[PDB]
mmCIF file of N, CA and C and ligand atoms in Angstrom:
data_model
loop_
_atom_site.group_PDB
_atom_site.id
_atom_site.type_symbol
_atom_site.label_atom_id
_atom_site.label_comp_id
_atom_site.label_asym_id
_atom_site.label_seq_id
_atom_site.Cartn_x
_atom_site.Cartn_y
_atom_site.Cartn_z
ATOM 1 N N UNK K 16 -21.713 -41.557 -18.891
ATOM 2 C CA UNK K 16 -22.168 -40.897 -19.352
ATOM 3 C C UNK K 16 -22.091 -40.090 -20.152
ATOM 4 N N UNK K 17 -22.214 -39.984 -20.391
ATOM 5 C CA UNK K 17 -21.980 -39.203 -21.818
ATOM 6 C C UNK K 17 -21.917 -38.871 -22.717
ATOM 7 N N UNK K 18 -21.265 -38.342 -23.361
ATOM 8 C CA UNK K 18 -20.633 -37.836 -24.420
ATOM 9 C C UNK K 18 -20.170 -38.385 -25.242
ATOM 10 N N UNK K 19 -20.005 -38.820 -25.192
ATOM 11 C CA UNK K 19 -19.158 -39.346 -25.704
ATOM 12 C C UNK K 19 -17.857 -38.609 -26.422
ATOM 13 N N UNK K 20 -17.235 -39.485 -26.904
ATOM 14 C CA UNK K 20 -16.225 -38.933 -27.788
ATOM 15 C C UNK K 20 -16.544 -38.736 -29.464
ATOM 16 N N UNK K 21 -17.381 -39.182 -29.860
ATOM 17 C CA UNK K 21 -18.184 -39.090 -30.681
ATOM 18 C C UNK K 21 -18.013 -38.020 -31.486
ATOM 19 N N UNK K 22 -17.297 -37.364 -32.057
ATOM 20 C CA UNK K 22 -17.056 -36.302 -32.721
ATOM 21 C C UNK K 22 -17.061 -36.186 -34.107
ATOM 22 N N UNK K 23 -17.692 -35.398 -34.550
ATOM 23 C CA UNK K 23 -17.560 -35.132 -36.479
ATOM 24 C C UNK K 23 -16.297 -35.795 -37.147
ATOM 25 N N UNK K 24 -15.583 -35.849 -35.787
ATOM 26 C CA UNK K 24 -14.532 -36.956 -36.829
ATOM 27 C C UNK K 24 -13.991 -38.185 -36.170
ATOM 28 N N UNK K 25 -13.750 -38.564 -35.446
ATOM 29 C CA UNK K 25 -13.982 -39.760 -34.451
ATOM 30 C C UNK K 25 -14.747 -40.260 -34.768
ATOM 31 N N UNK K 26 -14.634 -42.068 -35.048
ATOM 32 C CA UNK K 26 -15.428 -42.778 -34.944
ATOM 33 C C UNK K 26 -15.975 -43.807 -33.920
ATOM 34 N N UNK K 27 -15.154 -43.705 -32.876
ATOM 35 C CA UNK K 27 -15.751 -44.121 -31.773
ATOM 36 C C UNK K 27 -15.953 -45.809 -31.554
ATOM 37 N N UNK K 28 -14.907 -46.581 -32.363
ATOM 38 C CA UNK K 28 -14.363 -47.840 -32.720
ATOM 39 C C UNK K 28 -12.735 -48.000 -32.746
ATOM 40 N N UNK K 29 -12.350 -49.108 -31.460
ATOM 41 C CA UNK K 29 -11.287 -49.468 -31.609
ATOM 42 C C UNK K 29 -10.536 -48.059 -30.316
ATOM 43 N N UNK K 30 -10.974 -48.359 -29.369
ATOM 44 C CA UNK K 30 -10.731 -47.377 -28.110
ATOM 45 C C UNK K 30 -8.857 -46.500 -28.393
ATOM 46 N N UNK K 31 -8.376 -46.834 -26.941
ATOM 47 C CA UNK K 31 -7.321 -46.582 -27.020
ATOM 48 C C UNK K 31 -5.981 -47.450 -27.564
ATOM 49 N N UNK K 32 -6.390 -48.286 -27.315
ATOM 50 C CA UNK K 32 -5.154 -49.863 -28.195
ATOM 51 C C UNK K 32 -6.218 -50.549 -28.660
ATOM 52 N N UNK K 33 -7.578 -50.431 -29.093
ATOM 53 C CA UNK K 33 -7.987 -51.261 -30.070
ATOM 54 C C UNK K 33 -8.327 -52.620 -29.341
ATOM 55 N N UNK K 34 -8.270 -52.342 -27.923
ATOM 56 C CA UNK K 34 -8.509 -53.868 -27.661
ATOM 57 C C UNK K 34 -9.624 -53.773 -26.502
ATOM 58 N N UNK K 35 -10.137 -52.579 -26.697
ATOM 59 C CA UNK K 35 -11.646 -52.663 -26.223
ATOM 60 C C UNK K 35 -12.468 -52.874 -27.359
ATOM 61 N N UNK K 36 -14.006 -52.855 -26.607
ATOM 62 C CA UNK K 36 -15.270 -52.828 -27.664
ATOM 63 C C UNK K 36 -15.704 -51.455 -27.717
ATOM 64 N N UNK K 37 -14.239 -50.487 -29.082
ATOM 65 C CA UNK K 37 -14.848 -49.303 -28.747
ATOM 66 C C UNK K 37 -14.394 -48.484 -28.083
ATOM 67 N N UNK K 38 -14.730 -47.329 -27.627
ATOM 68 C CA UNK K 38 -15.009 -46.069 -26.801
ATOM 69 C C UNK K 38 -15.964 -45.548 -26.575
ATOM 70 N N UNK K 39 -16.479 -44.878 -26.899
ATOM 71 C CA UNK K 39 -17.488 -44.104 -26.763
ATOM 72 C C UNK K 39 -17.814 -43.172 -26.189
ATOM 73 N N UNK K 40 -16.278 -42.539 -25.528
ATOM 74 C CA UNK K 40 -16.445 -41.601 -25.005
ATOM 75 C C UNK K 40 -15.091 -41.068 -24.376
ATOM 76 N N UNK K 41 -13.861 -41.210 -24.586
ATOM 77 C CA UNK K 41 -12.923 -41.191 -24.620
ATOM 78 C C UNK K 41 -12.309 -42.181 -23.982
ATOM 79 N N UNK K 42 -12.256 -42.842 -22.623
ATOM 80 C CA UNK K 42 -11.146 -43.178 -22.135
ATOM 81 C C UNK K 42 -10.287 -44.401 -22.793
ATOM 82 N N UNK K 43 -11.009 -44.365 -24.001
ATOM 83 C CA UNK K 43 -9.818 -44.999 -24.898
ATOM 84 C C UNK K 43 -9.437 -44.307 -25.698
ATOM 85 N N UNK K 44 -10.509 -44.433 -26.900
ATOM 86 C CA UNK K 44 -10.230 -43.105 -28.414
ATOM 87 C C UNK K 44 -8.736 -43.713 -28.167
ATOM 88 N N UNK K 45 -8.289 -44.417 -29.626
ATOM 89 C CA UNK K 45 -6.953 -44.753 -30.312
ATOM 90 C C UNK K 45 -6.601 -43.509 -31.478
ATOM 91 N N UNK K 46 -6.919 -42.821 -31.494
ATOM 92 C CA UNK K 46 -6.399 -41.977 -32.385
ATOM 93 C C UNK K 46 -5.602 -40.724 -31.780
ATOM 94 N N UNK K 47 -6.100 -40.109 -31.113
ATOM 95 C CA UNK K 47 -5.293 -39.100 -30.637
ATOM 96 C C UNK K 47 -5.043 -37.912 -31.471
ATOM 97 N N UNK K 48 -5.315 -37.116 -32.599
ATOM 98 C CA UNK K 48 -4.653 -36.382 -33.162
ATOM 99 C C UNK K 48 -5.194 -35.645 -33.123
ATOM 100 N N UNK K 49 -5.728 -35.132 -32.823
ATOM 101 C CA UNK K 49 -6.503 -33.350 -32.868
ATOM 102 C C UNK K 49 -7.113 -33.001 -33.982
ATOM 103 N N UNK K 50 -7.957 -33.193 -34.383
ATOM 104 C CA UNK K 50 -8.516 -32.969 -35.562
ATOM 105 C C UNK K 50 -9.453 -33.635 -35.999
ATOM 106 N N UNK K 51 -9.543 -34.182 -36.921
ATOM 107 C CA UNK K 51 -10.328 -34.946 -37.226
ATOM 108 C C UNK K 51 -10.625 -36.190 -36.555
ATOM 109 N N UNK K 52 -10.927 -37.395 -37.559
ATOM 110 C CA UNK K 52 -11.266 -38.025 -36.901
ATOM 111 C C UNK K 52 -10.333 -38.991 -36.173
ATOM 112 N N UNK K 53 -10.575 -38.228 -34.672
ATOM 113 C CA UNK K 53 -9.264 -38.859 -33.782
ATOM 114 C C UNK K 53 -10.438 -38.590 -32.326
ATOM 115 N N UNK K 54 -10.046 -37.305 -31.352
ATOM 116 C CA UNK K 54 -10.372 -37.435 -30.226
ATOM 117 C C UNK K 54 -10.517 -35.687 -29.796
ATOM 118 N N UNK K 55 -10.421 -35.236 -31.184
ATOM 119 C CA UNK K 55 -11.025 -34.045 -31.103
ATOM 120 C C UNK K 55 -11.330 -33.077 -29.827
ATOM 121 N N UNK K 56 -11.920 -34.118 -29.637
ATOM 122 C CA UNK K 56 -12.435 -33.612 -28.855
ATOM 123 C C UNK K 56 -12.771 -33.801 -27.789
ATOM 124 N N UNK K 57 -12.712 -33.987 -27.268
ATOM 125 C CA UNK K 57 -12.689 -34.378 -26.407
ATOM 126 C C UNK K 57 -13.108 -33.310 -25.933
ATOM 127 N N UNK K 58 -13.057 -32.505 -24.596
ATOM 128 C CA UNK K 58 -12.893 -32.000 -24.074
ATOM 129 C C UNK K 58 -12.287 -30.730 -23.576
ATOM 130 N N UNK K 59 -11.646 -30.546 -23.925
ATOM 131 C CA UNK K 59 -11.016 -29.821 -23.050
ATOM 132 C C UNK K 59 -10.338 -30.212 -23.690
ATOM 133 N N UNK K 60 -9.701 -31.036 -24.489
ATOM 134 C CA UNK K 60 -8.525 -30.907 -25.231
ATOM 135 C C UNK K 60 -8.328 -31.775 -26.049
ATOM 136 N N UNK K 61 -8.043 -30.884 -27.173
ATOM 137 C CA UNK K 61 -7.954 -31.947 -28.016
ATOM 138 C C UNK K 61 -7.170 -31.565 -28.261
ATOM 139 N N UNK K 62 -7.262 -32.794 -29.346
ATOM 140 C CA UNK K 62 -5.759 -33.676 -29.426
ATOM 141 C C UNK K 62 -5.347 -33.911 -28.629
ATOM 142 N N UNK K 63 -5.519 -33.711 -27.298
ATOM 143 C CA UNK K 63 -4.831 -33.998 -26.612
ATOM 144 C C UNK K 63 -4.996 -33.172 -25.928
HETATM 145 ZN ZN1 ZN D 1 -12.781 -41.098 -30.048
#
């Protein structure tokens, strides 16, 4: 549900290793970097 991960900078393609269909809401998000488009946001923490 959710939320996704979806963030102003996240694109929400190519999860955590790229070998899902995607994310869409973090429990992949391959980027990781805090900021842009990565995983922002996540939550509670980004970047991480
Ligand atoms: Zn993401």
């Amino acid at each position: 549900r959710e939320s996704k991960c979806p963030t102003p900078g996240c694109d929400g393609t190519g999860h955590v290793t790229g070998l899902y269909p995607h994310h869409r809401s973090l429990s992949g998000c391959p980027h990781k970097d805090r900021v842009p488009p990565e995983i922002l946001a996540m939550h509670e923490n980004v970047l991480k």
